[PDB]
Amino acid sequence: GLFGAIAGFIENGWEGLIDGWYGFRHQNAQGEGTAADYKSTQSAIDQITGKLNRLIAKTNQQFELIDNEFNEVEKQIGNVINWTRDSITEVWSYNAELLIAMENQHTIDLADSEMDKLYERVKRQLRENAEEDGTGCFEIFHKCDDDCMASIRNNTYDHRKYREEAMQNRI
């Protein structure tokens, strides 16, 4: 749902990748290499995290019996209580259900978010040196060795270097 990346224009996703949530698969000089992006991986994690520490919570509200399991109470008040009780059970069953769906919708669309914010920051690094393949790859129009890959990966990559190269190469 939403945002476009996860199950969408990024055509499925990667069982290979086990170092985090997000990452880069490349191919160049040596061949294929895959290395997870810890800042996008920890951004998602640190947000889900914050939900669990809200919902996994210590309700100090105490309640006590009004009721009796062993010598059932007067009939009239007993029926009022169950009513009141069940009237509430409803509310919470509703409240719980809806909470879990609301947050699963946001948990998911939150994941799709952190991916569209990565793709579209690696387009801002790679200026006019490369192009949008369609499904979630850039075409680095010019060679990029396993130190040039690593310069995109740790956000140094100067596009000034290879701009002169790509300028023509891209024709």
């Binding site: 949530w21 210590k58 019996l65 062993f70 010598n71 998911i108 994941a111 991916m115 990029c144």
Partner: protein, 316 residues
């Protein structure tokens, strides 16, 4: 020469529901409704009292069973189905409210009210209230007439709550198996027990007659009760069918009352009890006994409600 972005997945994931979908596969999710009980009253740390064969209201009257308990003191109070508030058949007037009081009392502390008696018996005992041989309630006294049919000379007694806390005053009316037998005990005529506090007045006249044998005895003693205030006085005007309270009972503090069928366990500590054990969780919702007491998660109908902790699982 190229570069690809993307995300993780797994062989198979966990199905959850979203706002718009019933069952999207996601990577890691976790369960949000507690289902796992512990079949014991997880009581670590806690000053606990398992009444067993004493019934909570017995701790004021003092039948045989409730002898070890006449001045119990507690954080938790466990009530048992075996347990019973009486020896001489009868029952407590306005019962369940009183238990709701004693359950949260932190236990009770007794003090004598100081009644002595001129011109009657002070001592009536039954074969159902057995101590050494045949005995009675320990906190009470079966007040009779001196010999068979004789005068119950009309009486008045009174107890001032000395203390800053409120008291609990108890007394019983004796519904004797017949009008004939009401005499054999107390003497004849309109048998008026009267009870004046100050924030309460009222009266009680025994209704004697036939009713089937319980512990093989056809009579009944039912007990009544009031909360006597700091400084106040209660006054007991009567002429028969009266069970007189030896002692008034004050509350020690603060406690949790539960009712259960399972055993204590000092190993595991817990705050959410019910008659089937102890709900130890940090989950916002439990699906276990909708009358769980203590500090619980919320009851819900749902058995499972899976909350997502990862992205969409997409493989090829």
């Amino acid at each position: 020469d190229k570069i690809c972005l993307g995300h993780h997945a797994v062989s198979n994931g966990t199905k959850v529901n979203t706002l718009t979908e019933r069952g999207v596969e996601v990577v890691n999710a976790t369960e949000t409704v507690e289902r796992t009980n512990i079949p014991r009253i997880c009581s670590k740390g806690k000053r606990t009292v398992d009444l067993g064969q004493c019934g909570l209201l017995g701790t004021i009257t003092g039948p045989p069973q409730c002898d070890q308990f006449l001045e119990f003191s507690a954080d938790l109070i466990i009530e048992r189905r075996e347990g019973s508030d009486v020896c001489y058949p009868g029952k407590f007037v306005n019962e369940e409210a009183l238990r709701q009081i004693l359950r949260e009392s932190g236990g009770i502390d007794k003090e004598t009210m100081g009644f002595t008696y001129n011109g009657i018996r002070t001592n009536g005992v039954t074969s159902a209230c057995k101590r050494s041989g045949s005995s009675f309630y320990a906190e009470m006294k079966w007040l009779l007439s001196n010999t068979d049919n004789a005068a119950f000379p009309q009486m008045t007694k009174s107890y001032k709550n000395t203390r800053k806390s409120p008291a609990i005053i108890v007394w019983g009316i004796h519904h004797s198996v017949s009008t004939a037998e009401q005499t054999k005990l107390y003497g004849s005529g309109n048998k008026l027990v009267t009870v004046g506090s100050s924030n309460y007045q009222q009266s009680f006249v025994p209704s004697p007659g036939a009713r089937p044998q319980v512990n093989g005895l056809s009579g009944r003693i039912d007990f009544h009760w009031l909360i006597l205030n700091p400084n106040d006085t209660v006054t007991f005007s009567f002429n028969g069918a009266f069970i007189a309270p030896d002692r008034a009972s004050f509350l020690r503090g603060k406690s949790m009352g539960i009712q259960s069928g399972v055993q204590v366990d000092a190993n595991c500590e817990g705050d959410c009890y019910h008659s089937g054990g102890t709900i130890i969780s940090n989950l916002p919702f439990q699906n276990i006994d909708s009358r769980a007491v203590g500090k619980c998660p919320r009851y819900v109908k749902q058995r499972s409600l899976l909350l997502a902790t990862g992205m969409k699982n997409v493989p090829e």
